[PDB]
Amino acid sequence: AQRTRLGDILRPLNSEYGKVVPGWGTTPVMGVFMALFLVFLLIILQIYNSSLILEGFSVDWAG
Amino acid sequence: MTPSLANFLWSLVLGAAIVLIPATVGLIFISQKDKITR
Amino acid sequence: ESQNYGYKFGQEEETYNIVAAHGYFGRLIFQYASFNNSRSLHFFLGAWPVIGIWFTA
Amino acid sequence: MQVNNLGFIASILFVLVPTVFLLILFIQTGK
Amino acid sequence: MQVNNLGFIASILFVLVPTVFLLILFIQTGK
Amino acid sequence: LLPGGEEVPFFFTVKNFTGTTEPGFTSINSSTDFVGDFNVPSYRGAGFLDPKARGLYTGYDNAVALPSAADKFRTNKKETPLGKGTLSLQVTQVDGSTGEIAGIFESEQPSDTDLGAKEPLDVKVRGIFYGRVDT
Amino acid sequence: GLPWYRVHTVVLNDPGRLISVHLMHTALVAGWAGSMALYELAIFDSSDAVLNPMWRQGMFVLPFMARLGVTSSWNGWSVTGETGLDPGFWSFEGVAAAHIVLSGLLFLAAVWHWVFWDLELFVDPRTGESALDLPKMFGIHLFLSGLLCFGFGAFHLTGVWGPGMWVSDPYGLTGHVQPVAPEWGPAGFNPFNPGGVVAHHIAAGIVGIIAGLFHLTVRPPERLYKALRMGNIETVLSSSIAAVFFAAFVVAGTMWYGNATTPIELFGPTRYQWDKGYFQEEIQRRVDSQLAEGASLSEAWSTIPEKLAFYDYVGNSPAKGGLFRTGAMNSGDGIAQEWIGHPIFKDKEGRELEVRRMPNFFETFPVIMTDADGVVRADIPFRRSESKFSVEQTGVTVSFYGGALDGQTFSNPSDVKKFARKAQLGEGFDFDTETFNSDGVFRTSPRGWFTFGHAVFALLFFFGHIWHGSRTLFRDVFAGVDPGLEEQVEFGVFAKVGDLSTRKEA
Amino acid sequence: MESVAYILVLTMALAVLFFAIAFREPPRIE
Amino acid sequence: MESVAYILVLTMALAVLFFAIAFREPPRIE
Amino acid sequence: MDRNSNPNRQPVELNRTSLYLGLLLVAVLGILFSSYFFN
């Protein structure tokens, strides 16, 4: 393994290989964020698909 | 608050209440009551 | 290497586990919808398209 | 026939390029 | 320019055929 | 050079210009504006030779590089038609102590046609001029 | 030896050579972008931005430069049709040259990383084998992506430091690059609102910054580290292919249906504008407004911009092409030269008849003319033994308003039928079919070609996802199954499928 | 001349068939 | 399009030069 | 910095049967798509 100056500067960013938090960790919060992202995707899909019509604007070339 | 927005929010609520929640409650309950014995 | 090199032309021994295939397939659908007899399976494989083409002919 | 004037180069290359790839690979097998 | 409509296939093949000959020979050297 | 890469040469000239003002002048002042026509001769002379050595009073009269099709090309006939320009001299500064006149001009003239190889474009030239009047 | 379809697996456990092959890919992609741009500049005809815009000429990468602010060439012309603009270095040519140079630089860096593959950065300090901390890698790259997204949204698109983005009127007549303020209301989720695009990049860049910070600080849970095989780089390929085909489906869809990021002056009109008669409706409104003011038919139809009339021509719909009808749409109908004006057909009784327009689905379409209340009054019959509504029988005449034929009337049934067939395709235009030896079959626009390529690639990248996700999850059985499995896979022997600790013993 | 292209690709296919049959890898019992 | 052919053959020549210099057979003392 | 030999290099192989299959595939693909290239 050849050492370089940039490698030595960047060494500690590749120094935590395989480190984990025991158990489930931040999985529940992760699921909550994923559910919110699904809801957001549903919202923008339905706006684009004209199944969700909001006030103020029309999904149209005009605006 | 357009009717389409109201129906969307209700779809979220009722999907959770009619499908996911009763399903996961039933699944958890049955998995606990019928545990595999090692 | 290619997994095909795990078979040798003329070998005595079977190159795949039909029991594992049947366990998977009989769990994919139900145990009784899966063949455990290669002879019965290879008959079905031959008969189905052959009969269908006889009908269309 | 008023064919696409690029049809001949396209057909020739479409066949010849993968052909040479295959021939190169086959002839060097065993090195 | 009203070029020879066969110039492009000819130039492409004139270069590519000996090129592939050479590449085939080089890649299989040592078998 | 025009945007899009077209080169337009033209014979910028005031040859044989005769400009006249409005009747009623008693002095050369800021109001003087000479308006008239000038001749625009061909950009290329009749002695000019194109890259295949075809010309008007010199050079080939046909496409010698193609003996069988040598009389196909309308460009085998060169012409040098005499064009016309319109120039206006608007005088803006006069120095009566020395007879000098200076001003601005606007010209309108055709461009080069390449011995008739193309229709000429219309060229507009704006600039300044200076003259001295002998009294 | 390795089968031909696995040759690239030699860099699976060689981080230096993996960076090398990635740098070479990046070099080829950048070089393609530059060389494609130079080819397009070599063949682009900028002489008429109205009837020969870029999308009529097969321009594929030029619209993408224009979308983000590169609108002018060093040769003086600009895509909006303006001239005399001086864009500095960042012209179409400057951008192409930058990509070529970047391609060369990436190629040199790829060579270096290939040769000097064994850097100590790539080895695990505790052990001896090469190792990448993929979670921390993802944290750094997500943080960088967030910074770039925020910067692009907040400086480039807003015009604070940058040119802005292509914005146009709903009918594609005034397209120009302009700073766009972010729209922070619900209107930001209107796909036709460019302010929505600016707001997204500011907000998603911020959220990516925060997410990268979390991913840089918090280690993955053990459950997720084991379940997703976080120690295996093939897991990242599987999920990246998934995200990429998601994005490819999205871009194909927004290109096909129209978007603020897919303006019609750059990629051509959409098939839905033809289906719904979008431009036809707007043209009739402008004419009727002039008529209400007091103008005559010829004066009112003369107010119609030829660019607007050009959009209302089925030959410019992207749903009229062919899979092997190659090249620019000018290689089909030809280069549009001029709007011939608006035909008004009248029968001998003075009933105003309209030719029913060709729909996108039909390669051929019968010529039918209906009056105001939708009764067919004329047609071009196939069988003339029993025909009753022929133009010849019904004495149809056509008078033109605006365009080249303004103030002409055609009563010869030959020419009336010619113009009826013209009216089938929408507004009629004179074409130059000589410059490109045009064959007379419609091609599709860059809109259509982009959608096709990205929908097909997205579909194929679905297979890549399943393939690489399966390879990641089934790595221990890639070479085959265990010499046992004679007891585990049996039925009923265990309570839990596969669990050897649940044997029912019964 | 497209006829030449068509005949050439068809001939390549048929010649591949000939070589694949006449000169195949001989299956051997090992 | 003949311009493409000319640029391509010239590029092939220059790329061959690059590879012949950067990646040559290393002369070794034996 | 030295240029060390990489140990991850593997030989590539294409047997004769694969050659024949690939050549037939290329041939028939050309047979199929030539008519569409000429159009």
Ligand code: CLA
């Ligand atoms: C106020 C803040 C704000 C605003 C105004 C916007 C505004 C926008 N966002 Mg952004 N967004 C934000 C914050 C914001 N965002 C934040 C904080 C995040 C989190 C990082 C995101 C994440 C996000 C994503 C992931 C996407 C957007 C998209 C969009 C656009 C929606 C309109 C559109 O074209 O949708 C079109 C897109 C959709 C309607 C959703 C596609 C869903 C499809 C149907 C799923 C496909 C599944 C499957 C693979 C399909 C194959 C099956 C078959 C059909 C073939 C718009 C520009 C979308 C976009 O880029 O549009 C181009 C988009 O995909 N946003």
Ligand code: CLA
């Ligand atoms: C210095 C960098 C730089 C700059 C300024 C440009 C600038 C440009 N490039 Mg070039 N390019 C570059 C580097 C660069 N390039 C490199 C390194 C490559 C090789 C990969 C290319 C390859 C390339 C191609 C192939 C093309 C361009 C094109 C263009 C033009 C249009 C860009 C465009 O539409 O982007 C569009 C970009 C996007 C839509 C990016 C989307 C990113 C996705 C949505 C994010 C994915 C999610 C993210 C990873 C995670 C979420 C994080 C979030 C929460 C924050 C523009 C002149 C185009 C052109 O006009 O050619 C002449 C074109 O076709 N470029």
Ligand code: CLA
């Ligand atoms: C997403 C990619 C993409 C897209 C959408 C476009 C789109 C376009 N290009 Mg560009 N182009 C691209 C990539 C792309 N290009 C690349 C990568 C190159 C470098 C080779 C070029 C080089 C290029 C040139 C040189 C030209 C264009 C032109 C055009 C236009 C006409 C397209 C056309 O006629 O297609 C025709 C497409 C087809 C006939 C599809 C071919 C489908 C293949 C043959 C199927 C084969 C599949 C496989 C064999 C089957 C599988 C077998 C199985 C066993 C696996 C259009 C705007 C033309 C133009 O008008 O420019 C101004 C033009 O002259 N492009």
Ligand code: CLA
């Ligand atoms: C970012 C995308 C990506 C990346 C990095 C990889 C990377 C890899 N793939 Mg995967 N794959 C992908 C997408 C991707 N794949 C997609 C989209 C599909 C579905 C088509 C697959 C299907 C697939 C299969 C079925 C297999 C792999 C395999 C492999 C490995 C060896 C590949 C090799 O040696 O090819 C060598 C390929 C050639 C020598 C010739 C390929 C010629 C192709 C057909 C035409 C050339 C394409 C053209 C030049 C470039 C256009 C690309 C661009 C437009 C997308 C490697 C880890 C193999 C593997 O897992 O091995 C263990 C394997 O068996 N991949």
Ligand code: CLA
């Ligand atoms: C046929 C579809 C299919 C299949 C079989 C798989 C299979 C797999 N995926 Mg993939 N995936 C798919 C589609 C699919 N995926 C799609 C469309 C996406 C979005 C781009 C992803 C994104 C994705 C990621 C990011 C990852 C996987 C992973 C995996 C592997 C682990 C299992 C997993 O995570 O399941 C995924 C779970 C599902 C596909 C089920 C989702 C069901 C949703 C939540 C229901 C939505 C309901 C909603 C209300 C519908 C509204 C729509 C309406 C408006 C029209 C496995 C190989 C992982 C992997 O490769 O690990 C090695 C991984 O990291 N997948």
Ligand SMILES: CC(C)=CCC/C(C)=C/CC/C(C)=C\CC/C(C)=C/CC/C(C)=C/CC/C(C)=C/CC/C(C)=C/CC/C(C)=C/CC/C(C)=C/CC1=CC(=O)C(C)=C(C)C1=O
């Ligand atoms: C939210 C909640 C509550 C959760 C939901 C889950 C839950 C708890 C629910 C409880 C109830 C429940 C389970 C379900 C209720 C709903 C319900 C009944 C759903 C309907 C199911 C449905 C829609 C499916 C219908 C489709 C289907 C799978 C039908 C059968 C098809 C079938 C029999 C195909 C087999 C074909 C056939 C002839 C067999 C052989 C084929 C063949 C040649 C294989 C080759 C082959 C075979 C081998 O064999 C082996 C060996 C080898 C070598 C081999 O080559």
Ligand SMILES: CCCCCCCCCCCCCCCC(=O)OC[C@H](CO[C@@H]1O[C@H](CS(=O)(=O)O)[C@@H](O)[C@H](O)[C@H]1O)OC(=O)CCCCCCCCCCCCCCC
């Ligand atoms: C139609 C079908 C219906 C689908 C649903 C069916 C049921 C499936 C359940 C969902 C799977 C949950 C994900 C994985 C489990 C997990 O996170 O760890 C479970 C953890 C760890 O267990 C705890 O672990 C602790 C230790 S530690 O966490 O390992 O440190 C331990 O002390 C404790 O005893 C133990 O309980 O327990 C909890 O924290 C309980 C809450 C779980 C949170 C769920 C995640 C997502 C919720 C939000 C999503 C919104 C809902 C809408 C959906 C669209």
Ligand SMILES: CCCCCCCCCCCCCCCC(=O)OC[C@H](COP(=O)(O)OC[C@@H](O)CO)OC(=O)CCCCCCCCCCCCCCC
């Ligand atoms: C850069 C731009 C373009 C790049 C050019 C390179 C293109 C790459 C082309 C690769 C060729 C792939 C073919 C190799 C084929 C090949 O190597 O032989 C079959 C091959 C054998 O696999 P093995 O695992 O046994 O590997 C042994 C090794 O010798 C192979 O390297 O497996 C596959 O590749 C399976 C997928 C293709 C299977 C194709 C079989 C279909 C044949 C039917 C013939 C058609 C008749 C139809 C009648 C209707």
Ligand SMILES: CC1=C(/C=C/C(C)=C/C=C/C(C)=C/C=C/C=C(C)/C=C/C=C(C)/C=C/C2=C(C)CCCC2(C)C)C(C)(C)CCC1
């Ligand atoms: C080295 C160097 C250099 C140079 C550079 C250069 C010059 C480059 C270029 C580059 C380039 C110039 C590149 C390019 C590329 C291209 C590409 C990459 C392409 C591709 C293609 C493809 C991929 C295609 C495919 C296809 C087809 C064919 C058909 C249809 C389908 C598809 C699309 C698939 C310099 C001086 C800077 C310096 C440094 C060094």
Ligand SMILES: CCCCCCCCCCCCO[C@@H]1O[C@H](CO)[C@@H](O[C@H]2O[C@H](CO)[C@@H](O)[C@H](O)[C@H]2O)[C@H](O)[C@H]1O
């Ligand atoms: C870093 C590597 C890249 C090198 C740098 C790239 C910059 C060079 C620009 C040329 C690229 C092609 O871009 C463009 O090509 C056309 C095609 O001839 C040229 O066009 C020129 O010749 C054609 C025909 O001979 C004329 O019709 C045109 O009026 C004239 O300007 C343009 O002047 C040039 O701007």
Ligand SMILES: [Ca+2]
């Ligand atoms: Ca009759």
